């Protein structure tokens, strides 16, 4: 049902960002924005805001005006609403977390919005997921951390920033039966918030450890309806339902949740090695609840995860944009791919 | 429940075999025997019989006496019964198929037993699976090439060679609902023949193609009871039930079917690239029908498939022996690993 074409996005040159994983991207108009990243493992890279122009196929660095982000971070995320970008969380090797900032793409300046990790306010998070709608920025999951030898934990909550009010609130807690997760899929689809798959903390002491930890790849799917503020678990089906996985590319196009790649087996040494990464794309029809693989012609992106992804439109087609990530060689990549959807959604 | 230790078998030297996949190994006494193999992709290597002595940790080449196999093949297999090795099938790049041979490890000579692909006899096969018991060699599945521009199909049948009588017979055909498969798990376990997972030909036009083919990774498990001549499909369970896969190491130890590695995603170019390979080990308790992962201490074999594997006993421990195969680099390996089961099985 979901048909389309994979494309490798040409990058002609300019101030090209070093290869990275664990970073955030978003598009406003004809420009791609890029912030944060990891390379080598556990190491952040820079704090420039990179800008890719889809008309010129070249890179630049956005003017560092206003309240410039204080930390070079990995595990950070970025979304677009209107003409503003929003960056939340991530951390460096020294456990300094990025706070909440907006960037006005028109005036080309940063604004500090929220100090993170204060009592009663949104927490510092890294390897969280983010999405957005007309008047909200949403943050799901990811992992907290005290000090170096602390036992960091995951969130199962959503923090919601009302742009109009300039205020954070936590959405209803889905409760103990809902897995706390980092690097989960998180998207707005036809007016509702969807949480799917990801890397879970166990809520069952009976689940055995792997490499000294119970942590495992989720395959569960939930949706949150702002209209009712209620959570529901969604039973999804299909011969081609994807195996458990995390840190995958994902975007929403109409009724479809579209994913590509991701970690399908844990690395023995956490984020040190690449574990096992998928080279396959799956899409969930949120109406039929059926999963299917998708294919995109002769261009087939190689195994990768920890990519940055977002929804955008290129040459008149909405689809899934994939940038960076780590490869099975354990190297980071600067490659950018776009899956252009051709069929109705 | 299944507890044990992974070991890298040190290989000191001798006439050590070039790295290879898609080959056969078997053990008699304190010696490992090795025949056939693939490297580079789609290319065979040699027709020497390599011998690894576990007491000396050195390699030698067995005397090439008697009816030496006429073809250097990949996708061949070998099992041991008594002091004889039995080699069946495989092919070269030129679609010449290996016949059925024995090797007497005592007299050090090959004996030609059966011409394959004749009327009323066992068919030529490559990428089939093999196991054995007291008076039989068993062959399951694999793919038969017709001519160069031929299409090929898989078998769902078992050919059984009665050693004392020197005669082949086909076992009851499990029928259309049973997948025709190559690189399937195939073992005798506590008196029954088990067929599980593998790389299947589809029997449903509704299954969509991937990379131009419907072929897919199976996760189904069947068992055949010679005592009743009945096939039964077995429903297996577990949180840690392995995802669909093929070309994995596998062995039987008591009630356990023990597996490691394997192809979990297809390569876009068939056997040209490495696809996606697992670095994980799973075991099935054939009494409880529960799958579980296993771990083996600090030695963790990297992602691989198309390995040769067998059951043997090393240093008083029954277990899974893994040799050769291809890596996610798409290189072949000469590495040998043994998963030593510690508890009773």
From Swiss-Prot, chains A, B:
Q: Where is this site: Essential for catalytic activity?
A: 42
Give the recorded effect for residue 91 to A.
Increased activity with allylglucosinolate but reduced acticity with benzylglucosinolate in the presence of myrosinase, thus leading to increased proportion of epithionitrile and accumulation of simple nitrile at the expense of thiocyanate and allylthiocyanate
Q: Which domain of life is it from?
A: Eukaryota
Which consequence is recorded for altering residue 149 to A?
Answer: Slightly reduced activity with a lower proportion of thiocyanate formation
Co-factor requirement: Fe(2+)
State the UniProt keywords alphabetically. Iron, Kelch repeat, Lyase, Metal-binding, Repeat
Summarize the subunit comment: Homodimer.
Print the miscellaneous field: Does not contain the mannose-binding lectin domain present in other members of the family. The proton donor differs depending on substrates.
- What's this protein's name? N-(sulfonatooxy)prop-2-enimidothioate sulfolyase
The source organism is Thlaspi arvense
């Amino acid at each position: 049902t979901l048909q389309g074409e994979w494309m490798k996005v040409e990058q002609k040159g300019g101030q090209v960002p070093a290869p990275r994983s664990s970073h955030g991207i978003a598009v406003i108009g004809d420009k791609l924005y890029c912030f944060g990243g990891e390379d080598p493992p556990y190491e952040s890279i820079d704090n420039d805001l990179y800008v890719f122009d889809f008309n010129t196929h070249t890179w630049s660095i956005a003017p560092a005006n206003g309240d410039v982000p204080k930390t070079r971070v990995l595990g950070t995320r970025m979304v677009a609403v209107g003409t503003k970008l929003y960056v939340f969380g991530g951390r460096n090797k020294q456990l300094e977390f990025e706070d909440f900032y907006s960037y006005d793409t028109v005036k080309e300046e940063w604004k500090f919005l929220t100090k993170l990790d204060e009592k009663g306010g949104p927490e510092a998070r890294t390897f969280h997921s983010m999405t957005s709608d007309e008047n909200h920025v949403y943050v799901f999951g990811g992992v907290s951390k005290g000090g170096l030898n602390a036992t960091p934990f995951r969130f199962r909550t959503i923090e919601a920033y009302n742009i109009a009010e300039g205020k954070w609130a936590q959405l209803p807690d889905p409760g103990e039966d809902f897995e706390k997760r980092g690097m989960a899929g998180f998207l707005v689809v036809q007016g509702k918030l969807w949480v799917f798959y990801g890397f879970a903390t166990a809520n069952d002491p009976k689940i055995p450890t792997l490499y000294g930890s119970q942590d495992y790849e989720s395959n569960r799917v939930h949706c949150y309806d702002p209209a009712t503020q209620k959570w529901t678990e969604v039973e999804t089906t299909g011969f081609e339902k994807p195996s458990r996985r995390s840190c995958f590319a994902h975007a929403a196009v109409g009724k479809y949740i579209i994913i590509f790649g991701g970690e399908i087996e844990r690395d023995p040494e956490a984020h040190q090695g690449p574990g096992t990464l998928s080279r396959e794309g799956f899409a969930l029809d949120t109406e039929t609840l059926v999963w299917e693989r998708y294919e995109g012609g002769p261009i087939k992106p190689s195994n990768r995860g920890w990519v940055a992804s977002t929804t955008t439109t290129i040459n008149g087609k909405k689809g899934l944009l994939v940038h960076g990530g780590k490869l099975m060689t354990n190297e980071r990549t600067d490659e950018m791919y776009f899956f252009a959807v051709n069929s109705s959604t």
